Amino acid sequence: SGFRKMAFPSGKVEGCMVQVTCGTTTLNGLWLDDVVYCPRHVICTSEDMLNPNYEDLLIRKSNHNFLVQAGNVQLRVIGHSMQNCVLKLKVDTANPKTPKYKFVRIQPGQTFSVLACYNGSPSGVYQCAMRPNFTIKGSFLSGSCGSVGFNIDYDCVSFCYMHHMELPTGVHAGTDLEGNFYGPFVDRQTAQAAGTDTTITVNVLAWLYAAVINGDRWFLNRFTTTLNDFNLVAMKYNYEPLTQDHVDILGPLSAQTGIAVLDMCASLKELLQNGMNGRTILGSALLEDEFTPFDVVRQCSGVTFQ
Amino acid sequence: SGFRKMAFPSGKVEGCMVQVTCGTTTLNGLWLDDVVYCPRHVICTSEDMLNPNYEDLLIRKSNHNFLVQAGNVQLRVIGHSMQNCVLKLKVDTANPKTPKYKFVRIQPGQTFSVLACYNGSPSGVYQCAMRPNFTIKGSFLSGSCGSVGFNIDYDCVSFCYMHHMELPTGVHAGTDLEGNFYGPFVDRQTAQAAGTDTTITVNVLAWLYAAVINGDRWFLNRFTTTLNDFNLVAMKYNYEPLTQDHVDILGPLSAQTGIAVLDMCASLKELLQNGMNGRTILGSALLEDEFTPFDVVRQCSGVTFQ
Ligand SMILES: *C(=N)[C@H](C[C@@H]1CCNC1=O)NC(=O)[C@@H]1[C@@H]2[C@H](CN1C(=O)[C@@H](NC(=O)C(F)(F)F)C(C)(C)C)C2(C)C
Ligand SMILES: *C(=N)[C@H](C[C@@H]1CCNC1=O)NC(=O)[C@@H]1[C@@H]2[C@H](CN1C(=O)[C@@H](NC(=O)C(F)(F)F)C(C)(C)C)C2(C)C
């Protein structure tokens, strides 16, 4: 029983983390085989921050301008190249702690664990979701850049996020491990704002199923709804549109509970109208949207309380 | 900026988790030096757990009766003994991945990270608080027993919890690593209930300081109170007494924010009496009590461990 915002065990990612210094700028690197991946803005100065020409900044760099440190051991850079918004540093040593890995670009609503690091050293691990507006609600301070988001499937670490910047609203923006930003953001200190955020409807429905699996049913009602009527109401509370794809993905959780997806949709529709009335669901007074259908099936029972 | 429920990096513990099998029962073990620590009820059959005599059950067991599996290698047991509610299995090999560590017994309201494991394999990591009623609000299915709770002190892991059982309210009970239960519980399949819990007042105030640091301020007030008037209100809402210790411990947060402890106690008093008036604090509609003063200072000032 119980339900937690559970993170993946971080050990496979800790083993990859390095410190990268260019001039006075220090941030975190990801060391996989004989390549260190980091945010390209490690090569920026204070004057460069607004309108950096990265190609012009990089061309003035030698390999020995990059100081890469794995623990107290200095790695030796034998090559550098830029791919979109990531710097790729070729080093003379393959990381002996390299896990089975792959680079995946995730879609809004997808979750992952973040290993917040400073000076290539881990500070903590927490669970995040890619917001519909392509931000994450992270916990990042100075020196956290190059921190990475990941999932783990058996022994394989799928890297999906590298941290670049904080937006005015206190929310975070970053790239996949191929250096392409999520959302319309750019690695410049020019004025940028996150678009108005929405609630991840497919995830709230999953979390309500988790509540039923763990034996809570108070929020259920005797109603159903059409997919369209649900979306017309849901959009009025700043909820993501629920697609047929989302309904298909909730199929397994429907079967385990015996509650049709659109029956669960009628329950959510009621909760948005009524609030909580001093009650909680899985120890929350808000509808939680940072658990995916996969997260629920992973953490929850094959059986239900019932 | 940003504030997240953050676990310690789990890598140092991932390297210590093994699978322990006795007859048909399988659960998780902690492999440190040449000793494997696990719940003593691994020697029990499903029907022995009714009224187990662990003294009697163990004296009938031999070393080869304990199948201990680290990854793909079977370890050989050269001795077995009980300490309170934990079984200690002497093995042929000192764990080469053994971190610097100690066994620590924690107080209610103190937090730790739990590495959830199944068949000696880490599944997930989350942050917990020792409840005042000596339970944890964990997330545990069948086979999670022997999963451990820990804190990291620079490079030293302090082991504080071993998972033993789930109460009918869906909360969790276990021991320190010396096999002494937290709370009035016994490792028997007999009727047992969690005592009425209470809120950890020092943690809520600490969390309000984190909210202030991260720019959420609407709940502050011009009033002050005395400790004694606050505790009169606190106990009315089943909040823990706030001692002078607590006020001294929130010292480093009070000066750094410029908000006096008893002024923040005045803000808390108002939140309990009035509720939150449709508003949230760090994206929560409840008062969070699972962040310690130390936790807030540590996340908000960055950090590293080795
Ligand atoms: C990496 N070490 C930091 C991480 C930041 C610092 C505070 N919290 C974080 O997540 N990243 C940066 O310093 C990036 C970096 C220059 C400035 N920057 C920012 O995050 C800034 N924000 C923006 O420029 C904005 F608004 F456009 F997003 C800052 C004002 C410092 C928060 C570059 C090259 C984008
Ligand atoms: C260890 N692998 C499990 C973990 C449990 C299983 C369900 N969720 C968990 O957290 N521990 C147990 O199976 C322990 C074990 C016998 C019974 N038990 C329980 O957790 C049971 N509860 C109680 O005995 C109670 F209520 F008294 F606390 C159960 C009914 C299976 C939930 C022993 C020896 C205590």
Author numbering:
A (entry chain A), B (entry chain B): 1 to 306
Paper lines:
The SARS-CoV-2 Main protease (Mpro) or 3C-like protease (3CLpro) is a dimeric cysteine protease responsible for the cleavage of the viral polyproteins 1a and 1ab in 11 sites, including its own N and C terminal. Mpro substrate recognition has unique features and is specific for Gln residue at P1, hydrophobic residues at P2, and small side chains such as Ser and Ala at P1’. The absence of similar sites in human proteases together with the importance of the enzyme for the viral replication makes Mpro a primary target for antiviral discovery and development. Herein, we evaluated the effect of single mutations in the active site of Mpro from circulating polymorphisms on the kinetics and inhibitory constants of nirmatrelvir and ensitrelvir.
For nirmatrelvir complexes, we determined the crystals structures of the WT enzyme, as well as M49I, N142S, G143S, Q189K, A193T, and A193S mutants at 2.1, 1.9, 1.8, 1.6, 2.4, 2.5, and 1.9-Å resolution, respectively. In general, nirmatrelvir exhibited a similar binding mode in all mutants, maintaining most of the key interactions with Mpro-binding site residues. For all, the electron densities around C145 clearly indicates the presence of a covalent bond between the nitrile carbon of nirmatrelvir and the Sγ atom of C145 (∼1.8 Å). Mutants M49I, M49T, N142S, M165I, R188K, T190I, A191T, and A193V showed higher susceptibility to nirmatrelvir, with Ki values ranging from 0.005 to 0.013 μM, a no more than 2-fold increase in Ki values relative to the WT. Mutants N142S, R188S, A191V, A193S, and A193T showed similar relative catalytic efficiencies to the WT. Mutants M49T, N142S, A191T, and A191V showed significantly diminished inhibitory constants against ensitrelvir, with 3- to 5-fold increase in Ki values relative to the WT.
